Design a protein around this motif. Structure first.
Motif: not given
Ligand SMILES: N[C@@H](CCC(=O)O)C(=O)O
Ligand SMILES: N[C@@H](CCC(=O)O)C(=O)O
Ligand SMILES: N[C@@H](CCC(=O)O)C(=O)O
Ligand code: FES
Ligand code: FES
Ligand code: FES
Ligand SMILES: [Fe+2]
Ligand SMILES: [Fe+2]
Ligand SMILES: [Fe+2]
Lengths: 437, 437, 437
Positions: B75, B90-92, B107-108, C175-176, C179, C181-182, C185-186, C202-203, C338, C350-351, C368-369, C372
């Motif tokens: 991003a 801002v993505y994650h 997010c982890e 992918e977005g 996902d 967890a995004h 946040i976003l 958040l996780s 954002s 972002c993506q 978080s991926d 994905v």
């Protein structure tokens, strides 16, 4: 009639060192109107056969055509000062005559011999009947005279000129003017007697006759009376087309389709009467438009603005790829076979296709392309001999070979137009059509 | 003095892994004004030596310079949130300190060690007298101090700064400031005593003296009294030029000509008085323009709008290639040798040439390029040793080697300026010119 | 989970003859709204999987999808005349039916067999519930039925559709939407109970279950009561994502992320109620915007103007790379995590990253991926088998394999969502959610 990718490449590539670029360089190139450079006035950028150049008319009225880049440290020559019979780069003051000879380097010792040895790349220009011509071949001292193209040999009151940049390779635009059957289809009105006599027979048969400077293409149609109407389009090497006159206010139009680079073409159009002053009404309509639409000529006030550093900066149309030529669907529905708002525009949008260089290895020709195929044969044979054996085309050293006219003859069914039209197809000073178009 | 294509390539290519890009990376790069990033405010995109980056000032007032791309899933970092002493994608939610160290990955799992191992590419920034400097070399812990460039060591009231993007490769722009003979020609008025003393002798002779950090270039002219007027331009490695002062309101100007990429240059200009507060009138005219024309500095309100994602988005001029620098032919006819509407513009239009990268293998140098040729020699020797043997230039580890001034001295005919000007060419804190410019 | 440059290439390249372009061609492609081509009205340019095409609806209401280039001499088919149940090139009159079969060549002899042998490249189109679908695979006669995607099987009053062009490669946009967890946040608000239940944890941890047509991705979160909230995103081959519903005015959204070319994606978004007419208020807010901001859908009046010759000429957003999506720093400071002025825009900016094609060999994935990474595994395995052994994916010949729903389930801590949600994840005609989102 089927072309390899390789044959296509031989025809479309016009840059320095290329086959077709070498062959084009054997001929004088009509490249600007006289009026475009005023004596001691602003220089004017052009690009020809892939090369970026600057034309200027010095105070004594002579035109030079020089590199657009200063040979010192690379400053743009279009920003130079045109005065005292030279163009002077403003960076360090190097001044060049129309011949390319450097005349002064103010920052150098006055004893220095660098100046007299220095030349900017330059090409010889000739001027005739309001048109500037350049010779870009490697041996200027061996250049023939200008070609005996009648349109540029009549007094100016007999001729009307326009030019425009078209965003495609030269040859696909040239083809559009050796393609008799297109016109009634592309340029016709929705629904409805007829409008041109070409509309009477939509599938001409084709006969072509080669001569020293190109090919005559006779499109033979049937008449509602069982006579033949033969329209003979003329191709003259390397990039000329002549259009057979119509019935009303008959005139001889055509173009030199001058390659600017591999992707762009300077479409220099001429319309002349061979024997009388040009129709005043026609002249004005070319310049102003006709019923709010472009004619075959570009009108005077429909160009976009471009900076002086662009080539042909005053010849880029407001009708262009980026706006789909201002295509008007509603007019296509209601009034015109094609919704492009003018004659040249309808041609340009079709012939420019969906990419700047047509790949002929992908095309599918029919009988309507007989003349197109035959003209390509002439080009390819010439360029191949030039590559194979270094032989120049006959027409590159024979000005008198260009004395041709397109004709629109009415003849008995099955007649021999080559004999019946032999005299009418000959250009002569102030001779009239010799028939009724 | 004649350069191969290969030599030209060694000089113009500045991207990662290139010869000149490696050598440039050995020096601190002045890359932004302090004022451009406010503490906790918007980040600011830059591109330096071919690399796209984002600068931000955190809440505690410290500046970081990081990759423009988030190292997670790519991003744009210019859209990140600058707060709590970090910039957060801002993505994650990945948050980075000015050092590049990742501080949080929301997010982890909270046990996860990925975060402490993660760094965004980042470069060390130093800040001095309102200028941000970056070190982009592979071994930051071995970086020398900032160079002792006097312009950035005086109190701010003694110095005026501007920056602008120029659409050409760095070196041809730098050359323009080691080229004494150009100025009277390019920047003069049509017709008419004189305007600068350089106008008195249009062909200086050249003498150059190499030192540890570059070369001194003495342009020796004749005076209408048979003395010598020596203008000594200074080149400092890798990309500094110092301009000899004029008579009226004498000041020391120059540039770092910072390569943005192979086609663009950040023209960071400085004008300072070595001993007194800078002329208030001069300062304002730099900022506002002078008689409606740009000075050597870019005026404050003549930039185009660019989106935040573009590098140096607030430094792209309204005078640019795309509009031929708003060239004005009428003013060239009536008033100015060159019709570009200002001093830097006249330089830019010439030095930027007709393409972004000058091909020096095509140029034709004269004696007026003596200094240019000698400066190239210094660059080429340095870059070649770096490639051949891995040796760094002396000046890349010697801040005190940069303590130089350009000078404009009046001396007996044939004098030795290197001795007569020895002291005046030495930079010292708050020391005045030591002569009359 | 770590991808080579080579693996990245296999996934992003979708043009003719490529691995992923071959595999995409095995599936029906949703490519236009029904309403976009009116019977006998204007044709509409599209580009799909790297190929430039023209869709038109003939007078009898049937849609064809043909080459954008006339197979004669290359004129643009978007300028053709749509009438008498064909599209006719205006250059020489060649007329094509929806099947691609040429029907007339007016300039050719009437005996000529060229016409019946001639076809323009064309692809079969099917139409369902207001959506046009194309089959671009090499063996049309062996194409399966349309996929049983529920969103396109409900009556139209249950579904809302938008489409937009996004300036990046398809896969990074897809992918977005896998996902989980995004989102908090976003898309969250600055500062502040919560706004979505995803904001509570958040996780998420991840569990994925492959099936014949793709993968189910369960994002497991903690609830403030020590239950599990499982959001199960669905990937369906080759380019579908399904989004788990929210609490308020729950609906099932998703996209087909259709590759236009390697650099552009047609983002076809759907939002449906499985059992009731779609919320009237929601529908209007998609179309008009919500509090002056875009929703997940593109609003109806926020597209730029493009000429008819551009693909998807009415679907290019006023929020785009060239203006940094009209990013608003002040709103990022005051109100929104954002500063992009809408939901899809925040995703897109972002993506789409800092270049159109993400290089996954440079990324650094976290937990978080998980989803994905697992979806890429499915794609890569499929495309590699196709390259290695010519084997097609099961789902390319199994319409009934697409009958899936994303779900948002509340279940005991540690529950098995695959069993508890087995029925809710099954699509069925007019069946309701079967739980409370
Ligand atoms: N330039 C004319 C040529 C006419 C003809 O070839 O007969 C046109 O485009 O229609
Ligand atoms: N930047 C100044 C330099 C003056 C000089 O080299 O003497 C100019 O372009 O004129
Ligand atoms: N399109 C939705 C997806 C939501 C989700 O993945 O839960 C977003 O961008 O937020
Ligand atoms: S660049 Fe033209 S005279 Fe120097
Ligand atoms: S892309 Fe930056 S945190 Fe994920
Ligand atoms: S180019 Fe289409 S019919 Fe000739
Ligand atoms: Fe035509
Ligand atoms: Fe200058
Ligand atoms: Fe999102």
């Amino acid at each position: 009639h089927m072309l390899s990718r390789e044959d296509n490449e031989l025809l479309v590539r016009v840059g320095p060192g290329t086959a077709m670029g070498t062959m084009m360089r054997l001929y004088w190139i009509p490249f600007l109107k006289s009026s475009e450079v005023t004596a001691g006035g602003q220089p004017y950028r052009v690009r020809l056969l892939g090369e970026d150049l600057v034309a200027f008319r010095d105070n004594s009225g002579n035109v030079g055509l020089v590199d657009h880049t200063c040979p010192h440290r690379g400053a743009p020559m279009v920003f130079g000062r045109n005065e005292n019979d030279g163009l002077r780069c403003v960076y360090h003051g190097w001044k060049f005559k129309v011949s390319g000879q450097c005349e002064e380097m103010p920052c150098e010792p006055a004893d220095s011999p660098m100046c007299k040895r220095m030349k900017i790349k330059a090409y010889p220009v000739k001027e005739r009947n309001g048109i500037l011509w350049a010779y870009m071949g490697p041996d200027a001292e061996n250049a023939p005279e200008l070609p005996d193209v009648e349109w540029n040999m009549v007094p100016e009151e007999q001729v009307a000129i326009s030019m425009r940049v078209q965003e495609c390779n030269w040859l696909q635009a040239l083809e559009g003017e050796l393609d008799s059957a297109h016109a009634a289809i592309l340029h016709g009105r929705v629904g409805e007697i007829n409008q041109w006599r070409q509309a009477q027979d939509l599938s001409p048969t084709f006969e072509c006759v080669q001569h020293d400077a190109g090919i005559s293409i006779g499109a033979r149609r049937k008449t509602p009376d069982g006579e033949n109407y033969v329209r003979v389009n003329q191709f003259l090497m390397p990039f000329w087309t002549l259009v057979p006159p119509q019935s009303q206010f008959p005139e001889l139009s055509g173009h030199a389709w001058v390659p600017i680079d591999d992707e762009h073409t300077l479409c220099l159009m001429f319309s002349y009467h061979p024997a009388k002053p040009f129709y005043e009404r026609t002249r004005k309509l070319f310049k102003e438009g006709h019923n709010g639409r472009e004619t075959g000529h570009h009108s005077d006030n429909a160009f976009e603005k471009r900076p002086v550093t662009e080539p042909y900066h005053t010849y880029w149309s407001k009708f262009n790829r980026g706006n789909a030529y201002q295509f008007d669907y509603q007019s296509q529905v209601e009034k015109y076979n094609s919704g492009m708002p003018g004659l040249w525009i309808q041609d340009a949008a079709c012939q420019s296709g969906t990419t700047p260089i047509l790949d002929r290895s992908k095309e599918h020709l029919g009988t309507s392309d007989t003349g197109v195929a035959r003209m390509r044969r002439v080009l390819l044979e010439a360029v191949k001999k030039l590559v194979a054996t270094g032989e120049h085309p006959v027409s590159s050293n024979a000005p008198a070979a260009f004395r041709w006219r397109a004709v629109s003859l009415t003849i008995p069914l099955g007649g021999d137009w080559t004999k019946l039209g032999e005299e009418a197809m000959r250009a002569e000073p102030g001779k009239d059509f010799g028939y009724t178009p």
